[PDB]
Design an enzyme around this catalytic site. Structure first.
Site, PDB file in Angstrom:
ATOM      1  CB  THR A   1      12.902 -32.683  -0.892  1.00 55.83           C
ATOM      2  OG1 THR A   1      12.592 -31.356  -1.202  1.00 55.83           O
ATOM      3  CG2 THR A   1      11.833 -33.433  -1.533  1.00 55.83           C
TER       4      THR A   1
ATOM      5  CE1 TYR B   1      -3.759 -29.250  -1.673  1.00 55.57           C
ATOM      6  CE2 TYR B   1      -4.429 -27.268  -0.262  1.00 55.57           C
ATOM      7  CZ  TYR B   1      -4.776 -28.405  -1.086  1.00 55.57           C
ATOM      8  OH  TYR B   1      -6.124 -28.842  -1.043  1.00 55.57           O
TER       9      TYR B   1
ATOM     10  CE1 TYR C   1      14.022 -28.055  -4.373  1.00 54.68           C
ATOM     11  CE2 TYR C   1      13.806 -28.374  -2.168  1.00 54.68           C
ATOM     12  CZ  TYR C   1      13.856 -28.865  -3.377  1.00 54.68           C
ATOM     13  OH  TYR C   1      13.742 -30.030  -3.196  1.00 54.68           O
TER      14      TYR C   1
ATOM     15  NE  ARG D   1      10.543 -33.337  -4.714  1.00 54.59           N
ATOM     16  CZ  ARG D   1      10.296 -34.451  -4.417  1.00 54.59           C
ATOM     17  NH1 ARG D   1       8.927 -34.956  -3.808  1.00 54.59           N
ATOM     18  NH2 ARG D   1      11.176 -35.568  -4.765  1.00 54.59           N
TER      19      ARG D   1
ATOM     20  CE  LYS E   1      17.395 -29.094  -4.528  1.00 56.49           C
ATOM     21  NZ  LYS E   1      16.763 -30.080  -3.283  1.00 56.49           N
TER      22      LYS E   1
ATOM     23  CB  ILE F   1      21.184 -29.304  -3.446  1.00 63.62           C
ATOM     24  CG1 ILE F   1      21.723 -27.927  -2.849  1.00 63.62           C
ATOM     25  CG2 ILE F   1      20.383 -30.010  -2.122  1.00 63.62           C
ATOM     26  CD1 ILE F   1      21.076 -26.963  -2.452  1.00 63.62           C
TER      27      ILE F   1
HETATM   28 CL   LIG Z   1      16.710 -30.681  -0.292  1.00 61.41          CL
END
Ligand SMILES: [Cl-]
Ligand SMILES: NCCCC[C@H](N)C(=O)O
Ligand SMILES: NCCCC[C@H](N)C(=O)O
Ligand SMILES: NCCCC[C@H](N)C(=O)O
Ligand SMILES: [Cl-]
Ligand SMILES: [K+]
Ligand SMILES: [K+]
EC number: 4.3.3.7
Lengths: 292, 292
Positions: free
Chosen positions: A44, A107, A133, A138, A161, A203
Site C-alpha cells: 500500500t 471495490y 491483509y 481502504r 496483516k 508491517i
Molecule cells: Cl503493505
C-alpha cells in the site's frame, strides 16, 4: 522473516514518477543497518495502485537485487480480480522473494465465501507463503476471523496483516488458527498493544523513517518488556498518527526526503504533494521522535 | 442522455466467464423496447474490476455495436490510477459513446485535492461528458459537495452519480453547481427520494430486470407526480434491497437468468455463485415486483 519490525517500504521516485534506484538502495541499506526484519515491496505504502503490473514487478525485483540476500523481501501481490492476483504471484515464483502480502479485493466487496475462494485459488498457484491483509477502510471489505481460520488451513496461508486497529481481532483469530500462524499489525498507532495481546510484529509505515526504534520496540515487545517498549512507542506516537495527516504515503515520502533517505518526495496521481501545513505537522512529529 | 432511468448493465457471461454476445443483445433489445434512457457499459454492475483493459473496451464496443444507435451508451472509465483512467478514456474517444462514468479512486484514499486533480486531468484530454461517481462504501473515499462544486466548473464535467444514500447531498451539491449539472442516484432504495429532492434520474441496478417500471417511475418523478411514482417504487423496494442480499451483481445476474434475459448467471472471481437462500430471497422480491 514474518515477525518483528517489517517495513511497508515506499517506492521512491524521481521527479518523473519512476522508481529511483539510488534512493531505493539508500533505503534498503538503512533497513539492513537498522535491524528491520523484512521489507514489504510494493504494498500500500509502495503505491501498488499506480504502478502497472510490469512496473510493479520491476520494483520488487530491484528491491530483491539490492537487498542482495541481506534482508528478506515480501512481495505485495494483492489484486481485486483473482486472475490478476494469480498472475502477479506467478511473476515472483522462484524469484528469491520469501513470501507474498495479499489484500482482500477492494471495490467489488466480495462475500466471505468469495474471499475464501479468492485466497485459496491464489495459494494453489504458488509454493510461496501467503500473508492475508485486511484493511476495510481502504477496501470496503472485512475479512472476519472465522474466514481467516478457514483459510489458515491451507498449507501456505501462514499469516495475516490486520490493519483494522480493532485489537479484539488478535485473540479472535489466534483462537482459530495454529500456534505458528503469524499475526501482524497493520496499524502503527495500535501495533504495540497488538503485540502485547499476542501479535508477532508489525508491517509498519513508521518504520520507513524510524527503523531503528521500531526494530528495538518490537524486540522488547517480543521479550515481554512492554514498559520499556512503551517508552519508545510514546516517542513515536506523534509519527504513528501524523504520518496519516494527509493520505499515506504522502507524509512518509516527505519525511524520507526531509531525512535525506530519498532524493525526491514525488508521487503518482491521485496522490498529490504534501501541504505546507502537513510539512510542519510531520516535522514536529519527527522532532518529537528525535530524528530531526 | 443523462436523465431518467439509466441501467447499470450486467456483463452477461458464458460458463467460462467470457462475454456472451447473444445475451447482451437480448438485454440491449429489452432496454430499447422498455424505455430505458441510457446504458452504463462496464460500470460497477458490469464487473469492471475483473475485466482486463482489453476485455473492458471490447464489451463497450460490442454494446455500442448492438445498440446500433437506438439507445445512448455511457462507458465506465473509472480507475484508481489517473494514468489508467486517462488511457481508458482515450480508447473510447470518438467511439460513439455519449459520455463516461468515472468513479473516485478506490483503495488508495486520495485527498479532496487529489480527487480534484484526478478528475480535472481526465476531463482535460477528452471532449466527452464526464459523470463523477461517489460510492465511499466501495472506495474508502468520499467526494464531498465542495469538491464536486469545484469540478463542476470544468466544462465537460456535467454530473454526478451519488451512491452514498445520504440524501442531504442532493441539495448540498445543487446549491454549488449550475442548473445544468445532473444529479443521479446510485442507490436504488433511496433513488425516488433522491429525485423528489431535486435529482434528475438514477443509474440503476434494479432497471436490469424492471426496466419499464423504472422508466415510468423516473418520468412520473421528473413530472412531480411523486405519490404516483411511489406506488411503483413500493412494489420495487424488495428488489431495491434484495438485489444486494449477496454482492452485486450476483443477485441481479441470477434474476436476469431467471427471467430468461441472459443464458447463464456466471461471474468472475472473487464473485461466487448465489446461495440457495439468496435465490429464494431474490425470487420472492421478483414476484413482489410482479416480474415472475
Ligand atoms: Cl503493505
Ligand atoms: N500494481 C498492479 C496493477 C494495479 C491495477 C489497479 N490500479 C489496481 O489497483 O488494482
Ligand atoms: N477494468 C479495467 C481493469 C481493472 C484493473 C483492476 N482490477 C481494478 O479494478 O482497478
Ligand atoms: N496516459 C498517461 C497520462 C499521464 C498521467 C500521469 N499519471 C501523470 O502524472 O502525468
Ligand atoms: Cl455503474
Ligand atoms: K497454514
Ligand atoms: K460543467
Amino acid at each position: 522473516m514474518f515477525t518483528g519490525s517489517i517495513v511497508a517500504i515506499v517506492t521512491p521516485m524521481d521527479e518523473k514518477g519512476n522508481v529511483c534506484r539510488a534512493s531505493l538502495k539508500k533505503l534498503i541499506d538503512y533497513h539492513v543497518a537498522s535491524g528491520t526484519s523484512a521489507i514489504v515491496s510494493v504494498g500500500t505504502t509502495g503505491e501498488s495502485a499506480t504502478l502497472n503490473h510490469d512496473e510493479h514487478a520491476d520494483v520488487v525485483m530491484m528491491t530483491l537485487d539490492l537487498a542482495d540476500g541481506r534482508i528478506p523481501v515480501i512481495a505485495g501481490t494483492g489484486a481485486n480480480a483473482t486472475a490478476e492476483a494469480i498472475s502477479l504471484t506467478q511473476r515472483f515464483n522462484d524469484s528469491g522473494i520469501v513470501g507474498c502480502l495479499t489484500v482482500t479485493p477492494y471495490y467489488n466487496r466480495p462475500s466471505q465465501e468469495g474471499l475464501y475462494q479468492h485466497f485459496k485459488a491464489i495459494a494453489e498457484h504458488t509454493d510461496l507463503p501467503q500473508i492475508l491483509y485486511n484493511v476495510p477502510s481502504r477496501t470496503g471489505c472485512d475479512l472476519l476471523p472465522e474466514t481467516v481460520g478457514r483459510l489458515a488451513k491451507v498449507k501456505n496461508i501462514i499469516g495475516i496483516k490486520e490493519a483494522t486497529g480493532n485489537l479484539t481481532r488478535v485473540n479472535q483469530i489466534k483462537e482459530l488458527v495454529s500456534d505458528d500462524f503469524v499475526l501482524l499489525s497493520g496499524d502503527d498507532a495500535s501495533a504495540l498493544d497488538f503485540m502485547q495481546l499476542g501479535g508477532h510484529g508489525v508491517i509498519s509505515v513508521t518504520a520507513n523513517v524510524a527503523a531503528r526504534d521500531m526494530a528495538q520496540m518490537c524486540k522488547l515487545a517480543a521479550e515481554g518488556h512492554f514498559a520499556e517498549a512503551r517508552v519508545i512507542n510514546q516517542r513515536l506516537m506523534p509519527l504513528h498518527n501524523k504520518l496519516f495527516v494527509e493520505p499515506n504515503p504522502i507524509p512518509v515520502k516527505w519525511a524520507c526526503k526531509e531525512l535525506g533517505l530519498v532524493a525526491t518526495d514525488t508521487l503518482r496521481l491521485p496522490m498529490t504533494p504534501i501541504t505546507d501545513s502537513g510539512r510542519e505537522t510531520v516535522r514536529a512529529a519527527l522532532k518529537h521522535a528525535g530524528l530531526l
